[PDB]
C-alpha cells in the first residue's frame, strides 16, 4: 500500500536522523533499504516535501544538495534582464550572451551562452545562413539552468523577430575605428563549463533543514505506537536510544498525531527503561 | 604411435586395419599370432582368460606343501571342545609354571627400574648441563657476557651490496684475479674513507663492522689486510697493465652501471695500508680444535636471563642457517691438527647489543656438518667465546621461535596450578630440558622420549608386558644424551616419586608427562647421515630372512629356478607351516599352524562370527630400481648427455663458446649434490666435444 510505505520511509529517515546529523545525498538516501520510490512503476503518488528531489533520483543524478523549491515556481515568473555583445569573425558569427536569472524563491544565477554561426556573406540584401551551434555555461541548478535554456530561446535576441541593431556599431567595436534546438542537457550539469562550485552542504539533524546551521522547515509524520516502539528496539547500541528518545518529544511538540493509546503497549515501549529522558522534555 | 612426417597421418591406421584383416583371413604359431594381433591395436584389467597357464613340473611341489592341511569344512562343536581342551591344558602347563607374557604393574618397583635405567650412576659426567655440551657452553658465555656488559656504515654496506651483486655476473671468466680486483676496490675505498673524518676507523668502524686486522669482503669472506697488500704487490712489474686491463673492461661490453667513479682506477698507496695495519695490533683467532663448575646454578637464576638465553640461541641459529646459504662455487685465495691459524676464513655476523656484535667463523662451505667458532666484539676488542662442531640443517626450528617456546613453558607449568610449590621446581627443569633438546638434536633423544611415552602408558595403567624395560634403554654417546636423560627421569620421578595413584589429580599429571614425552617432535626428522641410513635399512630388511634361512642368491630374472633354489623354496614353505599347537618353543619365530587356520576358516564360513562372506557390489567389475633417493640416475645422465652431444653435433654445420653449458642449464630445470652432478655432466659433455673435435 504505497501510502503506508511512504510514511514508513518518512519515519525511517526521521528516526535515523534522530541520532546524528546527516546530508541528504545519495550516500544517505540510497543506502537505506526501504526505497520503494524507484518501484511503483505507476508512480503517481509520493510522500510530500521530498516529492521534488526523488523525482530526479529516478534518473540518478550525481548531486549533493540542490535548492529544490519548485513550490515557488522557478521555471516561470523570471526576470528578463538580458542583453548581447559584439561578434568576432574567424562568415563566422560568435556571440556571448550573459544573463542574471532569478527564481520565485530566494535564489540567483548567472547564465552565459557562447554561440557560433557559420553562414555565407550576402551580396546586398540580408545574409545567407548555413549552420548554428550553441553552448551553455554559468551557475544554475537543475531547475535554474533549465530556466536559462528555456528563456535563451524566448528572447528578442537574434533568433525571433529580426532585432538585429547593426547601425555600424559592432563592426566599430570589432574593427577599430571611430568614423561613420540545443536542449539536450536537462540536468544539473553546467554544460561542460562553468564557475567554481562544491560549497554550501545542507545537513539534516532534527527533521529541520540546516544549510549551514540555520533552521529552514520541518515536516509531519505519525508514529502510531506500534511502529515507533518496534523501531525502538536495538539498532546497535544504547546511547542511540538515549538520543532518539530525548529528541522524539521535541519533534512531537511540532506534531498533533497523539495516537499512542495508554495500555500494555506503553509497557512494551517501557522495556528500555529511560524514565528521566521521557520526563526531561515534559 | 606409428605416426611420422612422411605420410598424411591418415593411411597408417588403414594399413594396419587391412594387415590385421589379411592375417585374420588366413594364416600360414600359437602365442606369436596373439602377440602380433595384440601389437597392432590402439587401446585395450582382470579376467585374463586368454593366458595359457602352463605347468613346468614344479607347481605340484608347491601344491602338496600348501594345500594338504586345508579343508575348511570343520563343524562347530568339535572346535568348541577342542578349544576347551586347549585352554584346560594351557592353564596348568605354562601359566602355573610362570612362563607368561604379561604382569601387573607394581608401580614402586617400576620406579626403581626407571631410575636405574635412566639415571646414570656409573658415569663420570658432572650434573651441570652447560659444560657437558659445547653449544650450550658457548651460548651461556655469550648471554652472560652480554647481560652484564653516521652515513659511513650505510655507505659501506651499499658498496658491499654493489660489489656483491656485480660479482655474480662472472664477466671476467676467471675467479682468483676477479677476487683480487674486488679486494683492490675494497682497499681503495678504505683509503678513500680514511683520508678525512678521522673519527671513522676508530669509532664508527670498531663499534661497527671490523675486528683485529680482519675485514669482510664479498661472498661473506673475511680477509687479512696484510695479505691483501701482499697480493696487491704481485701483478705489478710482471704485468703492470693488469689494472689498466681491469679499467677499460668495465666500460665496453659491460653493464656500465656503477658508482666506482674514483674508488676503482686509483692506484693503492701501500703506505696508507701499512699504517692502518700497524694501527691495530694482532689478536688473531685460534679456533680451538678437537674442569671446575661455576655455572651460575641455573636452578637459582632470575626469571629474565632464560628468555635472553633463548634469544641468543635463536640468533646463533639464524647465523648458522645464513652460513648454510653461502656460495658453493667459491675457492679461497690460499689453502691451509690441533690449532690452525685463520687468515682467509669465512665469517657471519649476528647482532646482540648496541655496541657488541657476535661473529661466527668457519673454514669450509657446503651443505653438511662443519665446525664453527664463536667470537664477540664489545667496543673493538675481540674476545674468545668458544668453538663447536655440528650440522646447521638441524637448527631450523629455533630460528625465530624464541617466544612461542616461552609461552609453552608458562602454559604447561600453569597446567599444574593445583599445588603451590610444584611449579617452582618443575618450571626451570622443563625449560632446561627444552634448551638441551634444542641444542642437541639426535635420533637417540627422540627415541628415549618415545620410550618415556610408552613407560607412562604402562605405569598409569594396570597390566603391562614383561619385556617393557628392555625396550626403553638406548646406549649413550658423546656424553650429551646423559644430561637430557637425567633431566627427563628427574622430572618423571619428581612428578611421580610419592603417592601418585589414580585417585587424585592424575589426569593433568598424565597430560603433562605425555606432552613432555611428545617434546621429541622438536628434533627435525631428516637422517643426519644417509649412507648409514641405507646401511641400517638393508640391515633390518635382511636380518629376519637370513635368520629364517630362506634368502636365495640372484635368480634368473626371467622365471627359471635351479634345483637348489626350488629345493630351498619348498624347504622354506614347509618350515613356515611346521608349527604345532602344543610346543611352546616356537613362540617368537615366524610361522603358523594349518590346524588353527582350518578352525578359523570353518568357523567363519558357517556364519558363526560377527561377519560372513555375504559381500555385495561384486569386486569383479623411468627411474632405476638399483638406486632410490638419488637426485639423478645413470640412465638419465646418459640420456641427457646423448641429447646434448647430438644437438651440438647438429649445430656444427668449428667453434663453440661456454654457451653449451647453458644447454645443460636449459634441460636440467641447486644444492651441493646438484652442482657436483652438474659439474660431472659438464665434464662429460666437454670431453665429448673434445673427442669429436679429433
Amino acid at each position: 500500500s504505497p501510502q503506508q510505505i511512504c510514511t514508513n520511509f518518512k519515519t525511517q529517515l526521521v528516526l535515523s536522523s534522530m541520532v546524528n546529523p546527516l546530508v541528504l545525498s545519495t550516500s544517505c538516501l540510497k543506502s537505506f533499504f526501504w526505497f520503494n520510490e524507484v518501484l511503483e512503476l505507476e508512480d503517481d503518488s509520493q510522500i510530500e516535501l521530498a516529492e521534488l528531489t526523488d523525482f530526479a533520483l529516478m534518473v540518478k543524478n550525481q548531486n549533493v544538495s540542490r535548492a529544490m523549491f519548485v513550490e515557488d515556481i522557478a521555471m516561470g515568473y523570471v526576470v528578463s534582464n538580458f542583453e548581447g555583445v559584439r561578434i568576432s569573425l574567424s562568415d563566422h558569427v560568435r556571440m556571448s550572451t550573459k544573463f542574471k536569472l532569478k527564481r520565485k524563491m530566494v535564489y540567483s544565477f548567472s547564465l552565459e551562452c557562447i554561440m557560433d554561426v557559420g553562414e555565407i556573406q550576402n551580396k546586398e540584401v540580408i545574409l545567407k545562413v548555413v549552420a548554428v551551434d550553441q553552448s551553455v555555461s554559468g551557475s544554475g541548478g537543475n531547475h535554474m539552468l533549465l530556466d536559462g535554456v528555456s528563456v535563451v530561446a524566448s528572447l528578442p535576441l537574434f533568433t525571433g523577430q529580426a532585432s538585429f541593431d547593426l547601425a555600424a556599431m559592432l563592426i566599430e567595436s570589432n574593427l577599430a575605428g571611430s568614423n561613420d534546438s540545443p536542449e539536450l542537457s536537462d540536468k544539473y550539469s553546467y554544460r561542460l563549463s562553468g564557475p567554481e562550485n562544491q560549497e554550501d552542504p545542507l545537513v539534516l539533524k532534527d527533521g529541520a533543514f540546516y544549510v549551514g546551521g540555520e533552521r529552514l522547515s520541518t515536516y509531519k509524520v505519525e508514529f502510531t505506537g506500534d511502529l515507533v516502539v518496534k523501531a525502538l528496539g536495538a539498532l546497535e547500541d544504547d546511547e542511540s536510544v538515549v538520543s532518539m528518545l530525548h529528541q522524539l518529544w521535541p519533534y512531537l511538540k511540532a506534531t498533533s498525531q497523539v495516537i499512542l493509546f495508554q495500555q500494555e503497549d506503553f509497557t512494551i515501549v517501557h522495556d528500555l527503561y529511560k524514565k528521566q529522558l521521557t520526563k526531561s522534555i515534559e | 604411435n606409428y605416426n611420422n612426417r612422411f605420410v598424411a597421418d591418415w593411411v597408417i591406421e588403414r594399413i594396419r586395419w587391412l594387415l590385421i584383416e589379411i592375417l585374420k583371413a588366413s594364416k600360414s604359431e600359437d602365442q606369436e599370432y596373439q602377440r602380433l594381433i595384440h601389437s597392432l591395436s590402439n587401446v585395450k584389467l582382470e579376467n585374463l582368460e586368454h593366458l595359457k597357464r602352463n605347468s613346468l613340473d614344479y607347481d605340484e611341489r608347491l601344491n602338496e606343501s600348501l594345500f594338504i592341511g586345508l579343508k575348511g569344512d570343520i563343524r562347530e562343536s568339535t572346535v568348541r571342545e577342542e578349544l576347551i581342551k586347549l585352554k584346560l591344558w594351557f592353564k596348568d602347563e605354562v601359566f602355573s609354571k610362570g612362563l607368561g607374557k604379561f604382569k601387573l604393574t607394581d608401580r614402586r618397583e617400576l620406579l626403581e627400574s626407571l631410575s636405574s635405567l635412566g639415571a646414570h650412576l656409573d658415569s663420570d659426567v658432572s650434573s651441570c648441563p652447560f659444560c657437558n655440551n659445547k653449544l650450550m657452553e658457548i651460548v651461556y658465555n655469550v648471554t652472560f657476557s652480554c647481560v652484564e656488559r653516521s652515513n659511513i656504515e650505510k655507505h659501506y654496506l651499499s658498496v658491499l651490496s654493489l660489489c656483491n651483486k656485480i660479482k655474480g655476473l662472472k664477466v671476467f671468466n676467471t675467479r682468483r684475479n676477479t677476487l683480487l680486483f674486488l679486494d683492490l676496490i675494497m682497499v681503495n675505498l678504505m683509503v678513500d674513507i680514511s683520508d678525512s673524518c678521522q673519527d671513522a676507523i676508530e669509532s664508527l668502524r670498531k663499534s661497527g663492522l671490523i675486528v683485529g686486522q680482519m675485514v669482510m669482503l664479498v661472498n661473506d669472506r673475511v680477509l687479512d689486510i696484510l695479505e691483501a697488500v701482499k697480493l696487491i704487490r704481485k701483478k705489478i712489474g710482471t704485468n703492470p697493465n693488469w689494472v689498466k686491463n681491469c679499467s677499460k673492461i668495465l666500460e665496453r661490453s659491460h653493464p656500465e652501471i656503477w658508482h666506482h667513479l674514483s674508488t676503482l682506477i686509483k692506484q693503492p698507496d701501500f703506505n696508507s695500508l701499512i699504517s692502518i695495519a700497524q694501527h691495530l695490533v694482532s689478536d688473531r683467532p685460534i679456533m680451538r680444535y678437537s674442569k671446575i663448575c661455576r655455572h651460575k646454578l641455573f636452578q637459582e637464576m632470575s626469571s629474565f636471563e632464560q628468555m635472553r638465553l633463548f634469544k641468543t640461541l635463536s640468533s646463533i641459529s639464524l647465523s648458522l642457517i645464513n652460513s648454510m646459504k653461502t656460495s658453493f662455487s667459491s675457492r679461497l685465495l690460499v689453502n691451509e691438527f690441533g690449532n690452525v691459524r685463520l687468515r682467509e676464513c669465512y665469517a657471519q655476523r649476528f647482532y646482540l647489543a648496541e655496541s657488541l656484535v657476535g661473529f661466527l667463523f668457519y673454514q669450509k662451505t657446503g651443505e653438511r656438518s662443519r665446525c664453527y667458532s664463536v667470537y664477540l666484539s664489545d667496543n673493538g676488542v675481540m674476545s674468545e667465546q668458544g668453538s663447536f662442531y655440528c650440522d646447521p640443517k638441524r637448527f631450523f626450528l629455533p630460528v625465530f621461535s624464541d617466544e612461542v617456546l616461552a609461552g609453552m613453558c608458562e602454559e604447561m607449568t600453569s597446567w599444574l596450578d593445583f599445588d603451590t610449590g610444584l611449579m617452582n621446581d618443575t618450571g626451570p627443569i622443563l625449560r632446561l630440558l627444552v634448551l638441551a633438546i634444542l641444542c642437541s638434536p639426535s635420533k637417540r633423544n627422540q627415541t628415549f622420549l618415545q620410550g618415556l611415552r610408552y613407560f607412562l602408558m604402562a605405569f598409569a595403567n594396570q597390566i603391562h608386558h614383561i619385556d617393557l624395560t628392555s625396550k626403553l634403554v638406548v646406549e649413550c654417546k658423546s656424553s650429551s644424551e646423559v644430561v637430557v636423560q637425567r633431566l627427563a627421569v628427574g622430572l618423571f620421578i619428581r612428578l611421580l616419586s610419592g603417592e601418585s595413584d589414580a585417585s587424585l589429580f592424575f589426569s593433568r599429571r598424565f597430560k603433562y608427562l605425555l606432552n613432555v614425552s611428545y617434546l621429541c617432535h622438536l628434533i627435525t626428522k631428516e637422517t643426519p647421515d644417509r649412507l648409514t641410513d641405507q646401511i641400517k635399512c638393508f640391515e633390518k630388511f635382511i636380518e629376519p630372512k637370513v635368520k629364517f634361512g630362506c634368502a636365495v642368491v640372484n635368480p634368473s630374472l626371467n622365471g627359471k629356478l635351479t634345483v637348489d633354489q626350488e629345493d630351498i623354496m619348498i624347504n622354506g614353505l614347509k618350515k613356515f607351516f611346521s608349527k604345532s599347537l602344543r610346543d611352546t618353543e616356537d613362540v617368537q619365530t615366524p610361522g603358523v599352524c594349518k590346524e588353527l587356520l582350518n578352525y578359523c576358516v570353518s568357523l567363519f564360513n558357517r556364519g558363526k562370527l560377527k561377519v560372513s562372506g555375504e559381500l555385495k557390489n561384486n569386486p569383479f567389475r623411468i627411474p632405476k630400481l638399483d638406486e632410490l633417493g638419488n637426485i639423478l640416475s645413470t640412465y638419465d645422465k646418459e640420456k641427457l648427455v646423448s641429447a646434448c652431444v647430438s644437438s651440438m653435433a647438429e649445430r656444427f654445420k668449428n667453434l663453440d663458446p661456454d654457451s653449451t653449458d647453458y644447454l645443460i642449464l636449459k634441460n636440467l630445470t641447486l644444492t651441493e649434490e646438484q652442482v657436483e652432478s652438474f659439474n660431472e655432466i659438464k665434464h662429460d659433455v666437454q670431453v665429448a666435444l673434445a673427442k669429436m673435435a679429433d
Binding site: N8, Q12, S25, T26, S27, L29, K30, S31, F33, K60, Q62, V64, L227, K230, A231, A234, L235, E236, D237 | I321, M324, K325, E367, P392, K393, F395, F396, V399, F400, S401, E403, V404, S414, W415, D417, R508, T524, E526, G629, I631, L632, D636, N667, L668, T669, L670, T671, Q674, S677
Partner: protein, 349 residues
C-alpha cells in the same frame, strides 16, 4: 614468527601477509576470508570508510539475493580491474565524486600485479589463475625445510617482479615518496596514498576494493551476519568444553560437483575451452543443465577470478574437517560479539 620469517626474505609485510595478530576464539565459524576481513578491519582504528563499504556491500547483497533484479552484469563490471569496478559499484550503490576520490585514496603495493613472482627453488631435478589449476587438480584423480627457505631467500633477491621486463624489489620500494600527509602514517609500510606512488603506479591497487570483495565472499560463504559492527563484552584455566560451528549458508550448502564447470562455461567460454576439460568424457551431465544458475555461485566465482589471494572456490567444495572445537571458558569470556540485525532491518513484513 611467520611474519618475521617472511619479512626477513625482503618481500616486505603486506596488509594480508600471514595470519593476523591479536586474534580471538572465533577461529570457529570463520574461514580465511573472515580472518582476513578481521585483519583489514583492525588495520583501521576508527572504522568509517570500512563501515561505509560494508553498508555498500550490504546493499549489493540485499539487491543481489532476491532484491530488485540483478546479477550477471557484475560479471561484466568486475573483469576490468580494481578502480573502475569499485567506482561503478559505488554509484550502483549510491556515492559522490567525493567518495570516488576519497575511498580510492588508500592504496597498497602489490608486487604480483603483472603476473607472478618468477623464481626457481631447490626442487627435484628435471621439473593463468590458480582457480583453473585447482579445477585441474580436482578433476585429475627428501628436500629439507632449511634448504627450502635458503632457496627462497636466494630466489627472492634476484630479478623477480615483472613489468611491461624483469627487475628487482628494492627499487620498487625505494621509488615511493615519504610524503607523510597524515593519511599514509597510521600503518607504515602497509598502506600509501595516491600521490605517494606517482613515481611507480603499476604496482598500486586500492585496499577497500579487496575488503569489499572479501565481504561479498563471506556473504556467499557463511551468511549475512558479518555485516554488523563489532561490539565488546563487559576462568581457572581448567574449564575445557566443546563448540559446534554456528554458520548459516545461503548458497545451497550441498554444492555438488559439475556446478562450477557449467558456470565457467557460460560466463567465460574462452577460459572453458582451453586450459580446461581436455581430459573428460562425461561433459554431457554438466552440459544439459546440471542445475545451472546457482543461488550465489554465479557472482562469487568472478571474485576468485580477479583477486589471486582469496582461495574460496577451492575452499568451498571441502568438509570443515573439524566439526568440533575444544576451548576454555577463559577465552569464551572475552570473545567479541558480532551478530547482525536483519538487513531488511526487520520492519518489512
Amino acid at each position: 614468527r611467520v611474519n618475521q620469517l617472511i619479512r626477513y626474505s625482503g618481500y616486505g609485510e603486506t596488509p594480508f601477509g600471514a595470519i593476523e595478530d591479536q586474534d580471538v576464539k572465533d577461529w570457529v565459524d570463520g574461514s580465511r576470508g573472515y580472518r582476513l576481513q578481521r585483519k583489514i578491519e583492525a588495520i583501521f582504528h576508527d572504522d568509517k570508510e570500512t563501515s561505509f563499504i560494508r553498508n555498500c556491500a550490504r546493499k549489493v547483497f540485499n539487491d543481489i539475493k532476491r532484491g530488485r533484479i540483478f546479477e550477471e552484469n557484475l560479471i561484466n563490471l568486475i573483469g576490468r580491474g580494481g578502480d573502475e569496478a569499485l567506482t561503478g559499484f559505488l554509484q550502483y550503490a549510491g556515492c559522490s565524486e567525493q567518495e570516488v576520490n576519497r575511498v580510492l585514496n588508500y592504496r597498497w603495493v602489490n608486487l604480483s600485479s603483472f603476473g607472478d613472482l618468477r623464481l626457481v627453488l631447490r626442487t627435484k631435478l628435471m621439473t593463468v589463475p590458480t582457480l583453473i589449476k585447482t579445477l585441474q587438480s580436482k578433476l585429475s584423480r627428501q628436500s629439507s625445510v632449511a634448504s627450502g627457505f635458503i632457496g627462497f631467500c636466494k630466489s627472492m633477491g634476484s630479478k623477480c617482479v615483472r613489468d611491461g621486463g624483469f627487475l628487482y624489489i628494492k627499487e620498487v620500494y625505494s621509488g615511493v615518496s615519504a610524503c607523510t600527509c597524515e593519511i599514509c602514517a597510521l600503518k607504515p609500510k602497509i598502506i600509501y596514498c595516491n600521490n605517494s606512488l606517482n613515481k611507480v603506479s603499476q604496482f598500486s591497487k586500492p585496499i577497500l576494493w579487496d575488503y569489499f570483495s572479501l565481504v561479498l565472499t563471506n556473504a556467499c560463504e557463511l551468511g549475512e551476519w558479518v555485516f554488523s559492527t563489532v561490539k565488546e563484552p563487559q576462568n581457572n584455566q581448567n574449564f575445557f568444553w566443546a563448540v559446534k560451528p554456528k554458520v548459516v549458508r545461503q548458497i545451497e550448502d550441498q554444492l555438488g560437483m559439475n556446478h562450477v564447470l557449467q558456470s565457467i562455461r557460460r560466463n567465460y567460454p574462452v577460459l572453458f575451452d582451453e586450459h580446461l576439460t581436455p581430459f573428460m568424457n562425461d561433459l554431457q551431465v554438466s552440459r544439459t543443465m546440471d542445475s545451472g544458475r546457482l543461488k550465489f555461485l554465479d557472482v562469487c566465482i568472478a571474485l576468485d577470478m580477479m583477486n589471486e589471494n582469496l582461495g574460496i572456490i577451492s575452499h568451498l567444495l571441502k568438509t570443515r574437517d573439524n566439526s568440533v572445537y575444544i576451548v576454555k571458558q577463559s577465552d569464551c569470556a572475552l570473545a567479541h560479539i558480532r551478530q547482525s540485525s536483519y538487513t531488511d532491518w526487520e520492519l518489512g513484513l
